[PDB]
Symmetry: C2
Subunit: 545 residues, 2 copies
């Protein structure tokens, strides 16, 4: 009773006016002069308009990217202790990091090795974004309170800044706090009106006369010399540029793909990789720090309209620049806070994530904690690795149950999950859902010994002094590592020694090849491998009689 | 046409005489006085006899363990630049590492958290052992040549020592080389005769008169004060002790289990963990450096006989000690080389490993290279992580094929691997062997779009301007992460929009719960989930007509 089978041989003005206040900071947070953030936004929009495929996205300054480049800039400053002065040296450092990141992105795009973008899960990404949003929140807290705490960096930056704030809660400006409260209650085209009102009030009332920290005049136009990167700092920033490029292009391709799935569906991942690479090389020579697809802006916008944004930026870089100076830094802080509100709202729908899948929620929380309390790069690395390990954990504990026959059908279901299932005596069909390899080898052996009889104990009892065949269903066993071949041979040998016959059913072609290479089936011994659970069970029934 | 199923609610003298020459070195390699290796062997045998369960093993000095403790000792010496003198300080350092490793082992045994022992595969272990064997070979090369190269440590120790040897190949003793050649040709109870002859020749001929480096007199007995560990160096050695304890107890349990499987089969893993823990704490207070199950000795032996070994050791520690001094260090080198021959022979059977499984062979080679060229601890870590990643790689590229019906049966086989399979027109049964999660989501979508039609392209062609149902077999899909739920919903939506009906078959109970929680099945929409490939295919056949 066997079957023989043979194998084969426009709206841009809004964003453009939202980007002006949304840069000074993302530039101040980045630790550079405010006009250079505007340079970054302008060059990013212009470059993406020249070449790009998203057709609905706002590439440019990305909070998290600015935070990472700022952390790298601060570390390089502390290492060097810095013509170069202060702003210029940091700006060159940022440009060097940008050039290296763009080179990495373009190399990955050309090599077609962009598969490294699949290790992010979007849950790791949401957690990482939320952690960075909290980090930006604490960074802007000192502008919110008009404080003057010393610069801090490294693991535990969040808690260190918070405890410094607690140390000198007092001795504030008390005008920045008041205007921050006013801007907060207004915010909760609102941003444009808010910045206009704040600028008008600061200019009319002479806020800086009361020691209120405000934005100084940023040099209009300028930037005439296209200073190339120094390239001596290349080794000192390469490791940071790796993570910067990975995050930037992964977020860009994710946003492009999601918007294309919304409509159009014409986004080519390799083309976006090329575009984000050239959005970090050509601008890098033009005093820029980074570029990536911005989550919030994209929401504000929702690529010709992008040109409009650039135009507005150019106007702000041509004649509207003095209209924006002498503006209190607290307004930039509250603007940053209300833009991070969008990423912060992900907390509200935490139960929805918990209901769908628990391990993902656990990965999300672990990534959040590692990317907020610890450093950003360490947080992302902890996230990617934790996700890879979680896949391993699912294999280590694997569903395993006996199988029962469904009446008037050949369907074999799980008796531990489905009721009214018939099992004839002397036949036990074991089912192991996960792959069998070195990790769950002991678990597979223990589960089989528990559901069925234990051959070793019964043999030792016999030496001191019902069930006759076992049908091991391998339908769900995707691969069998060297340890698996040995485990299966050992199981068969023990059960043969006790007096039981072990039958393998529904084996994958790959598992069949692995068993054949391991000499499990000997030389056409037969009665060991079967193509269906039903056929093997009927064969056992015949063999018993 | 559906089925309704409801869910449930003696020989010891030989080893003892082989251990004397097999310690001086494993002590010299460890960077300590030779008599302390004998102390370690004696205390290990005595402790394991008092408590233990292997009943066939030779716990004691393990080459790799001695190498690791010696590397830690050398690094601590360089950090401190060292009453303490030279030998005593290093000995205290080793004892501290031993105490910390024993504490770690006993804590893991008590906590029943020994599951961390399942991440080694025995292929990673074989590669790690081979790499350490090469490291010991290069370390003993300088005794083989009677050289005097300066001490080296860190990543690239092997190549650095080799290039130093090349730098001064000349200016050798030329007597140590000759006696090493003689011992080599004799070796290739042989070891006992060899050491006896070497000692007799060295004593009679006055080899050290010709600047031949020989073993100095080691203090007989002694060790009366049980000097407790300093405990100030505890933080400086904890990270090394972690790896030391993991390797030691994993090797011990592996050897105990394999020998028990050979016969007896009474080894309890937790009891062995406790024993190896107490084999590194009580001796640690008695001037010992480490303890683990030795691979080679065990072969020499093959626990009452272990006592015999201790007795011999005690005699060597009582009155036979001066019988062993003034013995050329080259003899110890050749003895170490011929004992590493056993681990080196694993190269000969490399094709056998390649035939059984290729990825394991790749893991073995990667671990070998990382544990020989780079440092030992970095090699082991590179091994464990690489193995965990390799499981991920198998999922990223997953077998995927269409399914065909087997004549006069309900068996559905793979048409890409099995011939003479019937597929009626308009039905395509896709099979995805690996789990569906964030890693292979794109691969699953691409494979399905390739074998069947591509809904997005056909829809865009229709907008610019045969197959009617798809049965997705989920029998091998163990788990569905949040991304999987979204991918399946997107696939169903696209195929519904084009005009095709998507059917899921043989879903696991866990996958059913995941789909239900993700609102894939809506509210009893039916005709979406089926318990068998046959039932869903017949339902499609009826629905077409």
């Amino acid at each position: 009773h066997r079957i023989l089978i043979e194998r084969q041989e426009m709206s841009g003005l809004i964003v453009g006016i939202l980007l002006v206040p949304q840069s000074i900071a993302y530039s101040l947070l980045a630790g550079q002069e405010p006009v250079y953030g505007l340079y970054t936004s302008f060059f990013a929009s212009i470059i993406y308009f020249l070449l790009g495929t998203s057709r609905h996205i706002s590439v440019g300054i990305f909070g998290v990217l600015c935070l990472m480049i700022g952390e790298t800039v601060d570390r390089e400053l502390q290492k060097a202790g810095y013509i170069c002065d202060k702003s210029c040296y940091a700006i060159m450092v940022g440009s060097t990091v940008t050039f290296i990141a763009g080179v990495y992105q373009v190399a990955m795009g050309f090599f077609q090795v962009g598969f490294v973008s699949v290790y992010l899960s979007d849950a790791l990404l949401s957690g990482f974004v939320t952690g960075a949003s909290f980090t930006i929140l604490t960074s802007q807290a000192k502008y919110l309170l008009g404080l003057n705490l010393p610069r801090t960096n490294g693991v535990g930056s969040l808690i260190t800044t918070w405890i410094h704030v607690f140390r000198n809660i007092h001795k504030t400006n008390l005008c920045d706090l008041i205007t921050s409260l006013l801007c907060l209650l207004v915010l909760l085209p609102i941003e444009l009106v808010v910045v206009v009102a704040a600028t008008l009030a600061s200019h009319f009332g002479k806020l800086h006369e009361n020691y209120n920290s405000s934005i100084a005049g940023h040099i209009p136009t300028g930037f005439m010399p296209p200073k190339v990167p120094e390239w001596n700092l290349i080794p000192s920033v390469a490791v940071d540029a790796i993570a910067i490029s990975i995050i930037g292009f992964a977020i860009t391709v994710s946003l492009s793909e999601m918007f294309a799935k919304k409509h159009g569906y014409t986004v080519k991942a390799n083309q976006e990789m090329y575009a984000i690479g050239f959005c970090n090389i050509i601008p890098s020579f033009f005093h820029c720090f980074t570029t990536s697809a911005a989550l919030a802006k994209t929401l504000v916008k929702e690529q010709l309209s992008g040109v409009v944004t650039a135009l507005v930026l150019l106007l702000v870089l041509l004649v509207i620049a003095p209209l924006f100076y002498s503006l209190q830094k607290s307004v930039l802080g509250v603007i940053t806070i209300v833009n991070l509100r969008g990423a912060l709202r992900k907390f509200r729908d935490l139960p929805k994530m918990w209901s769908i899948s628990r391990m993902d929620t656990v990965i999300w929380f672990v990534t959040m904690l590692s990317s907020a309390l610890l450093s950003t790069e360490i947080g992302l690395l902890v996230g990617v690795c934790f996700s890879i390990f979680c896949v391993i954990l699912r294999t280590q504990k694997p569903k395993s149950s006996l199988l029962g026959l469904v009446e008037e059908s050949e369907v074999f279901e799980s008796v531990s999950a489905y009721k009214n299932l018939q099992i004839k005596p002397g036949i036990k069909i074991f089912r192991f859902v996960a792959p069998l390899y070195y990790i769950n080898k002991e678990c597979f052996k223990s589960a089989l010994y528990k559901q069925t009889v234990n051959p070793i104990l019964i043999k030792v009892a016999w030496k001191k002094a019902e069930l006759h065949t076992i049908v091991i269903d391998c339908s769900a066993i995707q691969f069998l590592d060297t340890a698996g071949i040995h485990t299966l041979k050992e199981v068969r040998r023990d059960y043969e020694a006790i007096g039981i016959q072990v039958l393998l059913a529904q084996c994958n072609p790959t598992v069949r090849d692995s068993l054949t290479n391991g000499e499990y089936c000997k030389k056409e011994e037969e009665n060991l491998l079967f193509y269906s659970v039903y056929e093997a069970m009927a064969f056992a029934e015949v063999s018993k009689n």
